[PDB]
C-alpha cells in the first residue's frame, strides 16, 4: 500500500495517533487540540518519556502500535517522533549490537519497517518528524547520524517533517532562540519551549488535509 507522501487526508469520524518520546509528548497535545477545533477529529497520544526503538524491553513501540491499530481500526494517521534515547549499543537475540554499526543500523531500520508495515498493512498514513540539532555536541553528532539513516531509508514511502533548520531559523546548527528573539528550546539542549511545540505542531497541521463529505468529487 502506497501512502501520500506529501500530506495525509483525515475524514470525520478519523483518529490521529501519536507515537514516540518525550519529543513528541510536549507537541501532541497542541495538534490534538487543532485536530479537535478545527475538524472535530479526536486523537489518541501514547507518547512516553525515555522511549524508543533501540530498546523494546523497556517499552515495546512496534508491537504498541500494532496493538494500537488493531483495537482502533478508524485511525489514519499515525505520528512518530523520537531519537534522543536510542544512541545505545542493544541486544537482538543473542545478537550484541554496537551503535552506528552496519549491523545496528540495520536491525533498527527493520524495527521502523515493522512500524511501516503495520501502519500501510492497515491504510494508515505515517507522519514522521526529523530529528533536531542538539546542544550537546556528542548527542548533535549521534542524532545527525541517526537523522540520515531515517531520512534516507523513509524519504518517499511516508511522510516526513524536518525540524532541525525551523527549530533554528534556519542556522544549520543549534540555537537557543530564533528572530524579536524567540526561544524554541528548553533548558536542557534538547526538547522544547511552548513556542518550539507550537511551531512544530503547526508544521505537523500542516500535513493534514481534512476532507468533506463531498470530496473528492466524481468525474
Given at each position: 500500500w502506497k501512502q501520500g507522501t506529501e500530506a495525509a487526508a483525515?475524514?470525520?469520524?478519523?483518529?490521529?495517533?501519536?507515537?514516540?518520546?518525550?519529543?513528541?509528548?510536549?507537541?501532541?497535545?497542541?495538534?490534538?487540540?487543532?485536530?479537535?477545533?478545527?475538524?472535530?477529529?479526536?486523537?489518541?497520544?501514547?507518547?512516553?518519556?525515555?522511549?524508543?526503538?533501540?530498546?523494546?524491553?523497556?517499552?515495546?513501540?512496534?508491537?504498541?502500535?500494532?496493538?494500537t491499530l488493531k483495537k482502533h481500526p478508524e485511525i489514519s494517521v499515525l505520528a512518530v517522533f523520537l531519537g534522543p534515547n536510542d544512541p545505545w549499543d542493544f541486544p537482538v537475540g543473542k545478537r550484541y549490537?554496537?551503535?552506528?554499526?552496519?549491523?545496528?543500523?540495520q536491525e533498527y531500520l527493520k524495527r521502523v519497517d515493522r512500524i511501516l508495515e503495520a501502519a500501510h498493512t492497515h491504510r494508515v498514513q505515517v507522519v514522521w518528524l526529523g530529528i533536531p540539532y542538539m546542544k550537546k555536541v556528542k548527542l548533535d553528532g549521534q542524532m545527525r547520524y541517526l537523522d540520515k539513516l531515517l531520512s534516507e531509508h523513509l524519504k518517499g514511502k511516508i511522510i516526513?517533517?524536518?525540524?532541525?533548520?525551523?527549530?533554528?531559523?534556519?542556522?544549520?546548527?543549534?540555537?537557543?532562540?530564533?528572530?524579536?528573539?524567540?526561544?524554541?528550546?528548553?533548558?536542557?539542549?534538547?526538547?522544547?519551549?511552548?513556542?518550539?511545540?507550537?511551531?512544530?505542531?503547526?508544521?505537523?497541521?500542516?500535513?493534514?488535509?481534512?476532507?468533506?463529505?463531498?470530496?473528492?468529487?466524481?468525474?
Open positions: 483525515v475524514r470525520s469520524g478519523d483518529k490521529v495517533f501519536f507515537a514516540g518520546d518525550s519529543l513528541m509528548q510536549g507537541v501532541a497535545p497542541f495538534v490534538q487540540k487543532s485536530l479537535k477545533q478545527q475538524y472535530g477529529i479526536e486523537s489518541a497520544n501514547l507518547s512516553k518519556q525515555s522511549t524508543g526503538l533501540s530498546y523494546p524491553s523497556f517499552f515495546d513501540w512496534p508491537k504498541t502500535i500494532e496493538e549490537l554496537k551503535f552506528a554499526s552496519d549491523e545496528w543500523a516526513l517533517i524536518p525540524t532541525a533548520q525551523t527549530l533554528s531559523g534556519g542556522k544549520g546548527r543549534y540555537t537557543d532562540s530564533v528572530n524579536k528573539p524567540v526561544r524554541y528550546r528548553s533548558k536542557d539542549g534538547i526538547h522544547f519551549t511552548a513556542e518550539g511545540q507550537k511551531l512544530l505542531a503547526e508544521k505537523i497541521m500542516e500535513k493534514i488535509v481534512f476532507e468533506p463529505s463531498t470530496q473528492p468529487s466524481s468525474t
